[PDB]
Write a protein that binds this DNA or RNA. Structure first.
Ligand code: CL
Length: 229
DNA sequence: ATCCAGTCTCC
DNA sequence: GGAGACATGGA
């Protein structure tokens, strides 16, 4: 039987039905059940598909693709790079904020790390791999997620209206060949982790995104976050 | 003071 | 991919 996540927007359910029905996805699911039995796996299972829940396929105008979820306790909750109200801003997101402060005039980094207000504007906050074992970055690489996130990329690429794809890191950048739509734009760099920050700083992805959207008659993203959440 | 938050080079 | 070099600014 297909293993279909609950409460997805209908457009995602229709686009991704073949994935939820596929043998590779059944095998990925079985592996993840074993992993959750034997280890602490992030994010919590109810949150794994939250990026799709918060940004319907029809609303996507920017697709941010990181590597894999944050791998410490109470960090990841399915929107890449985001943390819940109350949670310390992780290093990657501190670096995102540093780059925004330089790239977008007037951006003021808030004390929180909650990025829901970006998802609500059409920014799909994805990672190439959607789960991780505690303390072990990229521990779930190469187990089936990449086929599923290829399918997500492909569904967005099939849209006619311009989407900006921002590929952060080597693993996310493997998706570049799938982005063939004539109206789409790809921005790529190193990941914003402090361990790769020399490959991220100065790449101006936020302004480049807004310029591309504007030239296509799409509205820019409001990158400023609320001061409190 | 230690620990802990990627990607390049050769084979 | 494997092994190692070089990767950081804070709690
Ligand atoms: Cl994440």
């Amino acid at each position: 039987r297909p293993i279909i996540p609950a409460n997805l927007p209908e457009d995602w359910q229709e686009a991704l039905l073949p994935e939820f029905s596929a043998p590779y996805f059944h095998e990925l699911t079985d592996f993840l059940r074993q992993e959750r039995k034997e280890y602490t796996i992030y994010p919590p299972a109810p949150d794994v598909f939250n990026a799709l829940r918060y940004t319907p396929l029809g609303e996507v105008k920017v697709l941010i693709l990181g590597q894999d979820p944050y791998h410490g306790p109470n960090q990841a909750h399915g929107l890449s790079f985001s943390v819940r109200p109350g949670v310390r801003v992780p290093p990657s997101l501190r670096n995102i904020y540093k780059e925004l402060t330089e790239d977008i005039p007037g951006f003021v980094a808030p004390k929180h790390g909650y990025l829901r207000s970006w998802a609500e504007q059409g920014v799909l906050l994805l990672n190439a791999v959607l789960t991780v074992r505690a303390a072990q970055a990229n521990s779930h690489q190469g187990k089936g997620w990449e086929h599923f996130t290829d399918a997500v990329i492909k569904a967005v690429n099939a849209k006619e209206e311009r989407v900006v794809f921002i590929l952060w890191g080597s693993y996310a950048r493997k998706k570049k060949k799938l982005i063939t739509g004539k109206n789409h734009v790809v921005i790529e760099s190193g990941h914003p982790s402090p361990l790769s920050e020399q490959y991220f700083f100065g790449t101006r992805p936020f302004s480049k995104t807004n310029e591309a959207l504007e030239k296509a008659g799409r509205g820019p993203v409001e990158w400023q976050l609320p001061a409190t959440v």
